[PDB]
């Protein structure tokens, strides 16, 4: 059957495997039939415009919805008591009770409270009316229209960029550093100085009057002539109220440091300074400006960029709660928990994605001859060593961390908490925005250490053994994703490199889960004033189960009761949806293909033999999902479940507290 157009192997599959594997391989452009590197890069090029158009229409939706259905105005008036709103609920299924309960944040009808700090971010960057947002939205739709127009024009042979424009990666690297990053950085400082900071200081800047307005009275004259001093004018008084004349300074570039007390956020002036500095550094480096493999392999490129975006989004999460850059976001606890957990989980996805494409590189692109004695060749030279070391630090960190937590559990249970192995984080004290690191924090840090070790252990045993191993010397033959080599050599289930990404996603979720668990319990403790609770109970595992999971679940799971619904109903329900989704992942992770294939055989029999029903038949012979599809659907359920459950819990834990 035609679909999938690109793969005749599949298109001639007489089964439902054709439809699944189609959708699974529909973006592996490399593997499409008759795909030359030229067309490959051109196709990829156009897809990226599609992606970006999506991101812009996504942002567009944010602004459109908050404008139309939000309470952004009411919130800018009372940003500490008004709950900000994400969008309207129209749902024919809600009972009157649930419409009433979701009728919140002084909204006429049922709404969803926002928890992306979008209100805070927009207030900070200057937006003050629904008009500013509506214009942002319509603008961003038009940007997306342009980006789509672009991908279309580009794939059109008129402007179809040949292999040249892509082979010029070095040019692209320098351009990214300066022309994109540097340029946009200082453009953003433009926005900050002209609109953000004014609107912060109570002065309305529209597109109409900013041509009229000058940011700094003497600033225009100072540029290129003693520019640094004039720019550092009267700094904004602590008295200053955000978006009011009261205590408004005039400085546009400063190094005041710390946080604006009203908003408990990094000074807009400090941010503008930061960005100006970042821009200068980036542009300078641009002007100033494994080679073989990186240019050769698109997998190497994504892998690198994913590991990059991995660390970047991790640090974004780590910094965006410690060093709040948005007004009132520090006070909005649910948003800050949500954003941290969000960005940390996306961090873990981008990280593991890095190692995934790592392994794809090692089975599709890495030629051992091509690079005689490169870093990668040396890495493989002593795989057994890199793995034995990662193994050891894993078994070590693991045995000891689990042992200590279990020791603490045992002695505390036996009613002798004195006997606990409480180790103080001395180096944390030395280094220390920074919150008290106790022996609890120590144990959890080591947990996270161990888990991150086992994750990299797995997703490197993957990318190293991808080429092969004693159990399967020639894996590169069979490729990245394949079921197994059969029950041949004691059994080879899960021997592929894809299987290592699969096995490591679990550890990535465990690791980020420990991270965000620690984050959220610590913060709930402080946000309730019972930081004592964390400090005392975080040292044995029953304390995590009793105080974190058991204790902060109560509100959420009372979201709907036989007595009635409250606003947390939708979260209680999502909480269960995530438990169900997670568990459903176990169906696919534990029950493997053969059981199902026998069962489905019998259903094919029953269908063919049932009068009236037999009148219709499948086009595609029903078959059980593939070995690997079982693993993949398992993992997507497990992951989706994991995320949805925890998102529900993060929201439901923090929301009642505030």
């Amino acid at each position: 059957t035609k679909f999938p157009s690109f793969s005749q192997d599949l298109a001639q599959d007489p089964t439902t495997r054709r439809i699944w594997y189609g959708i699974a391989t529909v973006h592996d452009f490399e593997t499409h039939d008759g795909m030359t590197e030229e067309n490959l890069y051109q196709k990829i090029f156009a897809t990226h415009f599609g992606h970006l158009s999506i991101i812009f229409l996504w942002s567009a939706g944010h602004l459109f919805h908050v404008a139309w259905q939000g309470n952004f105005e009411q919130w800018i008036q009372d940003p500490l008591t008004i709950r900000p709103i994400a969008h309207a609920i129209w749902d024919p299924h809600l009972g009157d009770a649930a419409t009433q309960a979701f009728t919140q944040a002084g909204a006429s009808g049922p709404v969803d409270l926002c928890y992306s700090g979008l209100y805070q971010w927009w207030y900070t960057i200057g937006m003050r009316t629904n008009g500013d947002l509506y214009i942002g939205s319509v603008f961003l739709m038009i940007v997306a229209a342009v980006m789509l127009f672009a991908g279309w024009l580009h794939l059109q042979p008129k402007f179809r960029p040949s292999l040249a424009w892509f082979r010029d990666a070095e040019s692209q690297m320098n351009h990214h550093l300066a022309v994109l990053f540097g340029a946009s950085s200082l453009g953003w400082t433009g926005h900050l100085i002209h609109v953000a900071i004014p609107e912060a200081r109570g002065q309305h800047v529209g597109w109409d009057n900013f041509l009229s307005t000058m940011p700094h009275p003497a600033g225009l004259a100072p540029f290129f002539t003693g520019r640094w001093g004039v720019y550092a004018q009267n700094p904004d008084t602590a008295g200053h109220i955000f978006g009011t004349s009261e205590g408004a300074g005039t400085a546009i570039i400063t190094f005041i440091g710390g946080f604006h007390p009203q908003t408990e956020a990094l000074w807009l002036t400090d941010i503008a300074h930061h960005h100006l500095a970042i821009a200068v550094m980036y542009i300078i480096a641009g002007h100033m400006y494994l080679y073989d493999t990186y240019n050769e392999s698109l997998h190497f490129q994504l892998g690198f960029h994913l590991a990059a975006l991995g660390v970047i989004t991790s640090v974004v999460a780590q910094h965006m709660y410690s060093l709040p850059s948005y007004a009132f976001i520090s006070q909005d606890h649910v948003t800050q928990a949500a954003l941290y957990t969000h960005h940390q989980y996306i961090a873990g996805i981008l990280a593991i994605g890095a190692f995934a494409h790592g392994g794809i590189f090692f089975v599709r692109d890495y030629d051992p001859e091509r690079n005689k004695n490169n870093v990668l060749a040396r890495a493989l030279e002593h795989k057994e060593a890199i793995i034995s070391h990662l193994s050891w630090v894993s078994m070590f960190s693991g045995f000891h961390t689990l042992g200590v937590y279990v020791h603490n559990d045992t002695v505390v249970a036996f009613g002798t908490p004195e006997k606990q192995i409480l180790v103080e984080p001395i180096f944390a004290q030395w280094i220390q925005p920074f919150m008290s690191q106790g022996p609890g924090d120590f144990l959890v840090h080591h947990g996270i250490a161990f888990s991150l070790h086992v994750t990299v252990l797995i997703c490197v045993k993957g990318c190293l053994d991808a080429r092969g191993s004693k159990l399967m010397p020639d894996k590169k033959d069979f490729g990245y994703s394949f079921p197994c080599d059969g029950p041949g050599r004691g059994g080879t289930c899960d021997i592929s490199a894809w299987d290592s990404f699969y096995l490591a996603f679990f550890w990535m979720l465990n690791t980020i889960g420990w991270i965000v668990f620690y984050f959220n319990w610590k913060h709930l403790a402080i946000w309730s004033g019972n930081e004592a609770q964390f400090n005392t109970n975080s040292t044995y595992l029953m304390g995590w189960l009793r105080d974190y999971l058991w204790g902060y679940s109560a509100q959420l799971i009372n979201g709907y009761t036989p007595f009635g619904v409250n606003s947390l109903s939708v979260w209680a329900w999502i909480f269960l949806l995530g438990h169900l989704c997670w568990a459903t992942g176990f169906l696919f992770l534990i029950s493997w293909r053969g059981y199902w294939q026998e069962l489905i055989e019998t259903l094919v029999w029953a269908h063919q033999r049932t009068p009236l029903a037999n009148l219709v038949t499948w086009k595609d012979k029903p078959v059980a999902l593939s070995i690997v599809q079982g693993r993949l659907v398992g993992l997507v359920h497990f992951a989706v479940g994991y995320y949805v459950t925890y998102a529900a819990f993060v929201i439901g834990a923090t929301a009642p507290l505030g």
């Binding site: 157009s5 196709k43 156009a46 897809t47 415009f49 599609g50 158009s53 229409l57 567009a60 459109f64 404008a67 139309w68 105005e73 009316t129 629904n130 509506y134 939205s137 319509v138 739709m141 038009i142 997306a144 229209a145 789509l148 127009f149 991908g151 279309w152 794939l155 059109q156």
Partner: peptide, 29 residues
């Protein structure tokens, strides 16, 4: 606070990327 004129214009604009998405999608297929 957002008027019907505005809601309609927003929709009509959003229709443009819709057509162009259809176009780009077709292309990439």
């Amino acid at each position: 606070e957002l008027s019907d004129l505005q809601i309609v214009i927003a929709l009509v604009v959003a229709l443009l990327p819709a057509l162009l998405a259809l176009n780009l999608g077709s292309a990439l297929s």
